[PDB]
Amino acid sequence: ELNISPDEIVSIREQFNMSRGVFARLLHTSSRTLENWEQGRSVPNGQAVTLLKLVQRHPETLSHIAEL
Amino acid sequence: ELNISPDEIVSIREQFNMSRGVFARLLHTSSRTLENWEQGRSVPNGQAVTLLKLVQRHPETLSHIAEL
DNA sequence: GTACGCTTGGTGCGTAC
DNA sequence: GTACGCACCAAGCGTAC
């Protein structure tokens, strides 16, 4: 039952010192959609929650995504 | 933009020799939603596509999801 | 398995500030 | 960055087979 708050989403990419645009691009995610999540206008879908928590635990995941 | 065909999704799972229910569980995904993807009813969302492709390239990603 | 109908709300903008 | 409106359709069923 994974979930993630708007503040947690922001704190992930601020740990990496990445802007919203940089982080969204490296996550193969629309920056406007990421804006929705960080502002709290909608709940991210289940796989987006999994992906965010994966990247947080294993930041090299961003490199694996770039290798797809 | 990453794409994945319904047959591609099934073969990822059949690599692990897992039923639709088992694979959806380890991927923190509704088994009925996965049914939509494998039948071609719907296009998986962008983060779902990324997750599936990570798993296809790195099977250990499945175990990493369980650590979450 | 397969397939189709349904409600809900996320997606991904456009726009203004 | 903030916040709101909008169309489109994915999500996650319930059901029939």
Numbering used by the authors:
A (entry chain A), B (entry chain B): 37 to 104
From the paper:
The higBA2 TA system from Vibrio cholerae consists of an mRNAse toxin HigB2 and its antitoxin inhibitor HigA2. Antitoxin HigA2 forms a tight complex with HigB2 through its N-terminal disordered region (IDR), which folds upon binding. Here we show that in addition to the primary function of HigA2 IDR to act as a toxin inhibitor, the IDR also contributes to specific and high-affinity recognition of the higBA2 operator to regulate its transcription. The HigA2 folded domain confers specificity towards a single inverted repeat operator sequence, while the IDR enhances its affinity.
To understand the operator specificity of HigA2, its structure in complex with a 17 bp blunt end operator fragment was determined by X-ray crystallography. HigA2 belongs to the HTH-XRE family of DNA binding proteins and binds each half-site of the operator through its HTH motif formed by helices α2 and α3, while helices α4 and α5 form the HigA2 dimerization interface. These residues interact with both strands of the half-palindrome. In its first conformation, the side chain of Arg77 forms a hydrogen bond with O6 atoms of the guanine 5 and guanine 12 on the opposing DNA strands. The side chain of Glu71 forms a hydrogen bond to N6 of the adenine 3 on strand 1, while Arg68 and Asn72 contact N7 atoms of the guanines 14 and 12 on strand 2. In addition to structural changes of the DNA molecule, HigA2 slightly contracts upon DNA binding.
